[PDB]
Amino acid sequence: NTETKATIGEGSVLEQIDQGSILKLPSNLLFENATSDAINQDMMLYIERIAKIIQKLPKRVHINVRGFTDDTPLVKTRFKSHYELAANRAYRVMKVLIQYGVNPNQLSFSSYGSTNPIAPNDSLENRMKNNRVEIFFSTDANDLSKIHSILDNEFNP
Amino acid sequence: TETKATIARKGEGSVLEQIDQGSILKLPSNLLFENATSDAINQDMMLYIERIAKIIQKLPKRVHINVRGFTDDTPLVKTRFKSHYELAANRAYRVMKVLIQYGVNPNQLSFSSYGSTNPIAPNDSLENRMKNNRVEIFFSTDANDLSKIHSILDNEFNP
């Protein structure tokens, strides 16, 4: 079990994988609703906290803000695809993280569309998980790569 | 650790780079797009993406593929694009869609945007500015064995 309930802000989870850490935030911690990028102001404070924690981090950490949606139809709104919707949600989280002073050079945003469900869509809590945002923290370490390349150049002709 | 990636064979500078958590295939804008300010793709570059799509099916089942967009910081005056972020996302998006066309599994794809941050060279000549307009495809897995080992040891030994 590489997952712990986070707070700071209930329902979030911190997961560790071997290449980095993932902060998973349910839709409702951030957005008015699952099918829009309007970031409810009652949660501006939550992103401020994450931003502050990022500033306890070395400058070599990249921060990648990731968007996810369910299979819900998109007629209701301005977006053309779930890819588009998820990108826009992740961009907004990113921009707010920049508002609070995270360095743009340490940030990117990604969209997974609806292709990465964590759960079936058989509730509300489940819907919120499928519409989560994830913040992924890693670096670009290449020591092992350089080691291998040096030896490989020196030994494989 | 960076090696030339023979694909277009005109001397564009597609490169493969290895880092500790994955592999990066670098593709210059000229290889994919008409200009550095649109996402309409070169009609000749399709075969080259098809090639990559085919090599993806050869990869381990655990692999995720992230298509990353980057731009120079040259002002946007011309287009429908309200930002470098928006421009770069659309470029990564279009490339991702082509990969899908050619049978890469969507459940293993995503696309990312770095806007004009993280340049490969200073934005100070027309040469370097164009160097910053590339697309990078990143390959990695979500291995968490080491994390699970650690968490099991920690629960027996700590709290």
B interface test, pick of A15, A17, A148 with most B CB neighbours within 10 Å? A17
- Residues B115 and A10: their CA atoms lie apart, in Å, by 32
**Structure token pair of residue B58:** 């050869």
A17: left (phi over 0), alpha (psi -120 to 50) or beta: beta
- Residues B153 and B145: their CA atoms lie apart, in Å, by 12
- Residues B10 and B27: their CA atoms lie apart, in Å, by 13
Q: Give the minimum alpha-carbon distance from A146 to chain B in angstroms, rounded to a whole number.
A: 6
Cβ–Cβ gap A17/B147 under 8 Å: yes
Q: Could you give the count of Cα atoms lying within 13 Å of A109 in the half-sphere of its Cβ?
A: 30
- Residues B103 and B92: their CA atoms lie apart, in Å, by 17
Nearest to A140 by CA among B114, B151, B132: B114
- Residues of chain A in contact with residue B66, where contact means CB-CB under 8 angstroms, are 110
B interface test, pick of A22, A69, A81, A83 with most B CB neighbours within 10 Å? A83
Alpha helix locations (H) across chain A?
44-54, 82-99, 125-130, 143-155
**Where are chain A's structural domains?**
1-157
Which residues are CB-contacts of A143 (< 8 A; sequence separation ≥ 6)? B20
- Residues A29 and A88: their CA atoms lie apart, in Å, by 16
Q: Could you give the count of Cα atoms lying within 13 Å of A110 in the half-sphere of its Cβ?
A: 25
Residue B92: how many other CB atoms lie within 10 Å: 27
Interface of A with B (CB under 8 A): 1-2, 15-20, 64, 66, 83, 87, 91, 104-105, 107-113, 115-116, 138, 140-146, 148-149
**Structure token pair of residue A87:** 């990108």
What technique determined this structure?
X-ray
> C-alpha angle with apex B4: B2 to B10, nearest 5 degrees?
155
- Residues of chain B in contact with residue A138, where contact means CB-CB under 8 angstroms, are 21
Q: Are B100 and B106 in contact (CB under 8 A)?
A: yes
Q: Judging by DSSP bridges, how do beta strands B64-69 and B135-140 pair with one another? A: antiparallel
Q: Could you give the count of Cα atoms lying within 13 Å of A71 in the half-sphere of its Cβ?
A: 7
DSSP structural state of residue A68: -
- CATH T-level topology, domain B1-159: 60s Ribosomal Protein L30; Chain: A; (3.30.1330)
- Residues B129 and A62: their CA atoms lie apart, in Å, by 23
- Residues B71 and A55: their CA atoms lie apart, in Å, by 26
Top CATH class of A1-157 equals: alpha beta
Q: Measured in whole angstroms, how far is the alpha carbon of residue B157 from the centre of its chain?
A: 42
**Structure token pair of residue A142:** 């290449």
Q: Judging by DSSP bridges, how do beta strands A62-67 and A133-138 pair with one another? A: antiparallel
What strand order describes the sheet that includes B109-113? A3-5, A13-17, A20-25, A133-138, A62-67, A107-111, B109-113, B64-69, B135-140, B22-27, B15-19, B2-4
- Position B152, amino acid: I
Cβ–Cβ gap A18/B144 under 8 Å: yes
Q: What is the CA radius of gyration of chain B?
A: 18
Q: Nearest Cβ partner of B18 from A66, A112, A145? A: A145
The values of phi and psi at residue A105, to 5°, are -60, -15
DSSP states of chain B as a string? Answer: -EEE--SS-SS---EEEEETTEEEEEE-HHHHBSSTT--PBPTTSHHHHHHHHHHHTTS-TT-EEEEEE--------SSS---HHHHHHHHHHHHHHHHHHTT--GGGEEEEE-TT-S-SS-S-SHHHHHHTT-EEEEEE----HHHHHHHHHHHHH--
Nearest to A113 by CA among A69, A157, A71: A69
- Residues B82 and B113: their CA atoms lie apart, in Å, by 14
Residue of B nearest to A15 (CA): B147
Cβ–Cβ gap A115/B106 under 8 Å: yes
